[PDB]
Design an enzyme around this catalytic site. Structure first.
Site, PDB file in Angstrom:
ATOM      1  N   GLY A  23     -23.882  28.526 -38.429  1.00 31.16           N
ATOM      2  CA  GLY A  23     -22.660  28.037 -37.807  1.00 31.16           C
ATOM      3  C   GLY A  23     -22.701  28.062 -36.294  1.00 31.16           C
ATOM      4  O   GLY A  23     -23.597  28.660 -35.690  1.00 31.16           O
ATOM      5  N   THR A  26     -17.024  28.334 -30.317  1.00 36.76           N
ATOM      6  CA  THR A  26     -16.696  28.836 -28.982  1.00 36.76           C
ATOM      7  C   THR A  26     -16.889  30.353 -28.877  1.00 36.76           C
ATOM      8  O   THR A  26     -17.012  30.898 -27.774  1.00 36.76           O
ATOM      9  CB  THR A  26     -15.250  28.472 -28.582  1.00 36.76           C
ATOM     10  OG1 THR A  26     -14.360  28.790 -29.661  1.00 36.76           O
ATOM     11  CG2 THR A  26     -15.139  26.983 -28.258  1.00 36.76           C
ATOM     12  N   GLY A  28     -19.531  31.805 -30.279  1.00 34.75           N
ATOM     13  CA  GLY A  28     -20.980  31.984 -30.248  1.00 34.75           C
ATOM     14  C   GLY A  28     -21.645  31.259 -31.404  1.00 34.75           C
ATOM     15  O   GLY A  28     -21.308  30.110 -31.699  1.00 34.75           O
ATOM     16  N   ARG A  29     -22.586  31.931 -32.063  1.00 36.76           N
ATOM     17  CA  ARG A  29     -23.335  31.331 -33.171  1.00 36.76           C
ATOM     18  C   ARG A  29     -23.559  32.297 -34.331  1.00 36.76           C
ATOM     19  O   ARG A  29     -23.663  33.508 -34.132  1.00 36.76           O
ATOM     20  CB  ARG A  29     -24.685  30.786 -32.682  1.00 36.76           C
ATOM     21  CG  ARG A  29     -24.586  29.566 -31.778  1.00 36.76           C
ATOM     22  CD  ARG A  29     -25.934  28.904 -31.573  1.00 36.76           C
ATOM     23  NE  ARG A  29     -25.827  27.731 -30.708  1.00 36.76           N
ATOM     24  CZ  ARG A  29     -26.196  27.694 -29.431  1.00 36.76           C
ATOM     25  NH1 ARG A  29     -26.714  28.768 -28.848  1.00 36.76           N
ATOM     26  NH2 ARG A  29     -26.054  26.573 -28.734  1.00 36.76           N
ATOM     27  N   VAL A  30     -23.636  31.745 -35.540  1.00 39.18           N
ATOM     28  CA  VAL A  30     -23.992  32.510 -36.735  1.00 39.18           C
ATOM     29  C   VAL A  30     -25.394  32.102 -37.186  1.00 39.18           C
ATOM     30  O   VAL A  30     -25.672  30.913 -37.358  1.00 39.18           O
ATOM     31  CB  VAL A  30     -22.964  32.306 -37.883  1.00 39.18           C
ATOM     32  CG1 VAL A  30     -23.384  33.063 -39.138  1.00 39.18           C
ATOM     33  CG2 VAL A  30     -21.577  32.750 -37.444  1.00 39.18           C
ATOM     34  N   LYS A  46     -23.706  37.062 -36.685  1.00 38.43           N
ATOM     35  CA  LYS A  46     -22.804  36.454 -35.726  1.00 38.43           C
ATOM     36  C   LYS A  46     -23.144  36.996 -34.345  1.00 38.43           C
ATOM     37  O   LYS A  46     -22.939  38.176 -34.068  1.00 38.43           O
ATOM     38  CB  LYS A  46     -21.357  36.788 -36.093  1.00 38.43           C
ATOM     39  CG  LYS A  46     -20.286  36.035 -35.322  1.00 38.43           C
ATOM     40  CD  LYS A  46     -18.935  36.686 -35.579  1.00 38.43           C
ATOM     41  CE  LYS A  46     -17.779  35.772 -35.239  1.00 38.43           C
ATOM     42  NZ  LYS A  46     -16.472  36.379 -35.627  1.00 38.43           N
ATOM     43  N   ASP A 143      -4.865  33.995 -38.526  1.00 41.73           N
ATOM     44  CA  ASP A 143      -5.648  32.767 -38.379  1.00 41.73           C
ATOM     45  C   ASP A 143      -6.225  32.237 -39.702  1.00 41.73           C
ATOM     46  O   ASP A 143      -7.409  31.900 -39.791  1.00 41.73           O
ATOM     47  CB  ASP A 143      -6.757  32.972 -37.338  1.00 41.73           C
ATOM     48  CG  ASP A 143      -7.202  31.669 -36.688  1.00 41.73           C
ATOM     49  OD1 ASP A 143      -6.480  30.653 -36.807  1.00 41.73           O
ATOM     50  OD2 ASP A 143      -8.279  31.667 -36.053  1.00 41.73           O
TER      51      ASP A 143
HETATM   52  C1  LIG Z   1     -20.111  30.068 -39.787  1.00 49.73           C
HETATM   53  C2  LIG Z   1     -19.104  30.695 -40.785  1.00 49.73           C
HETATM   54  N1  LIG Z   1     -19.199  32.171 -40.795  1.00 49.73           N
HETATM   55  C3  LIG Z   1     -18.479  32.989 -40.029  1.00 49.73           C
HETATM   56  C4  LIG Z   1     -17.675  32.636 -39.002  1.00 49.73           C
HETATM   57  C5  LIG Z   1     -16.833  33.477 -38.110  1.00 49.73           C
HETATM   58  C6  LIG Z   1     -16.125  32.839 -36.941  1.00 49.73           C
HETATM   59  O1  LIG Z   1     -16.681  34.677 -38.288  1.00 49.73           O
HETATM   60  S1  LIG Z   1     -18.609  34.697 -40.463  1.00 49.73           S
HETATM   61  C7  LIG Z   1     -19.805  34.202 -41.622  1.00 49.73           C
HETATM   62  C8  LIG Z   1     -20.507  35.097 -42.437  1.00 49.73           C
HETATM   63  C9  LIG Z   1     -21.446  34.574 -43.335  1.00 49.73           C
HETATM   64  C10 LIG Z   1     -21.677  33.187 -43.406  1.00 49.73           C
HETATM   65  O2  LIG Z   1     -22.617  32.640 -44.299  1.00 49.73           O
HETATM   66  C11 LIG Z   1     -23.017  31.258 -44.291  1.00 49.73           C
HETATM   67  C12 LIG Z   1     -20.954  32.318 -42.572  1.00 49.73           C
HETATM   68  C13 LIG Z   1     -20.010  32.833 -41.667  1.00 49.73           C
END
Ligand SMILES: CCN1/C(=C/C(C)=O)Sc2ccc(OC)cc21
Length: 336
Positions: A23, A26, A28-30, A46, A143
């Site tokens: 992912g 804004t 950051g990145r996952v 994250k 949220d």
């Molecule tokens: C990108 C979504 N995402 C998150 C997003 C935020 C803003 O927290 S936290 C998260 C944990 C595992 C995952 O697996 C695919 C995805 C995941």
């Protein structure tokens, strides 16, 4: 922009081998990582931007995530699991359980064609269970939206829709988790004046009458509707228009809430200052309608769902359905 620069194969903490990017945002990145200190288990990392405000916001999430794990040792709460967290050269990193795509992502990849009612039932139940857990522990998520509810596994199978004459994607397992606790507020904590993403914002938040747990239920109401129809319930980015949409869909705003709000510019003669004859008023009339006119069937299970949505979209926060009540609804009867 303050993002961490990384390549596929890098090692953070001498522990996390980067596999792919799951992912972006804004915050950051996952990133998908092999956790070599956990037997080679795939985790979701994250990585928060090296930015003062986002770092302070990440620490508040970590605080909530630590309370989530504490009060749920067996992992039954249906909220995302944090396995580890650390500070990496200014970047706050949080290690999660690996999940699938968001319920939004999946819906989007499916041409915004709605989820089947039997899947809505299982998704809604889990959503209510997960947030109820937070509510029981003096927390409000604030949220809640399709983006912050992820499938555990987003693998699908093609299924024909005889009515619409189209092929649909059907997720094999409807197990979901609630993510993003960066906005989660404890009862004792400083409450922000404005919370929630526009589309899922409760009227008490808009009218600034104070908010707590009930405002999450309002969001869940909108989310469940979105699961059933495919498109968002309140498509607007304007307060006065949002309130007009609320009135068209659900009926008049309670007189007490108009009386008590300081947002008095939106109101005239003790009623909503909205002219339906305008091009803005005509837009509202032709883009939304009374809640039950959205029914795809007249079968009993469809009516029970809208009984639930309607009760969740009760204007008065104190008179609004609680999530403890929601789990006891006739709509969830046909589940194991
Ligand atoms: C990108 C979504 N995402 C998150 C997003 C935020 C803003 O927290 S936290 C998260 C944990 C595992 C995952 O697996 C695919 C995805 C995941």
């Amino acid at each position: 922009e303050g993002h961490l620069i990384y390549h596929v194969g890098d090692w953070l903490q001498e522990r996390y081998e980067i596999v792919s990017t799951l992912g972006e945002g804004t915050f950051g990145r996952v990133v998908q990582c092999v956790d070599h200190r956990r037997g080679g288990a795939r985790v979701a990392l994250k990585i928060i931007k090296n930015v003062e405000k986002y770092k302070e916001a990440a620490r508040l999430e970590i605080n909530v995530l630590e309370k989530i794990n504490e009060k749920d040792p067996d992992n039954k709460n249906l909220c995302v699991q944090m396995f580890d967290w650390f500070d990496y050269h200014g970047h706050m990193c949080i290690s999660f359980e690996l999940l699938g795509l968001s319920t939004f992502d999946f819906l989007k990849d499916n041409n915004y064609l709605p989820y089947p009612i039997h899947q809505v039932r299982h998704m809604a139940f889990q959503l209510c269970q997960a947030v109820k857990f937070l509510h029981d522990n003096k927390l409000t998520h604030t949220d809640l939206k399709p983006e912050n509810i992820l499938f555990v596994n987003s693998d699908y199978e093609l299924t024909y829709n005889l009515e619409k004459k189209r092929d649909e994607r059907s997720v094999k397992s409807t197990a979901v988790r609630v993510v993003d606790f960066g906005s989660a507020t404890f009862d004792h904590e400083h409450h922000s004046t404005i919370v929630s993403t526009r589309h899922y914002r409760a009227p008490e938040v808009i009218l600034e009458l104070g908010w707590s747990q009930p405002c999450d239920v309002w969001s869940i109401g909108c989310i469940i509707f979105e699961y059933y129809v495919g498109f968002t319930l309140f498509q607007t980015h304007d307060n006065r228009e949002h309130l007009a949409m609320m009135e068209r869909i659900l009926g008049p705003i309670p007189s007490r809430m108009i009386r008590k709000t300081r947002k008095q510019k939106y109101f005239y003669r003790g009623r909503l200052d909205w002219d339906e004859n305008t091009s803005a008023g005509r837009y509202v009339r032709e883009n939304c309608k009374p809640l039950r006119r959205y029914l795809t069937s007249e079968a009993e299970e469809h009516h029970q769902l809208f009984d639930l949505i309607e009760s969740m979209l009760e204007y008065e926060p104190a008179k609004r359905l609680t999530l403890g009540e929601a789990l006891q609804h006739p709509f969830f009867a046909r589940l194991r």
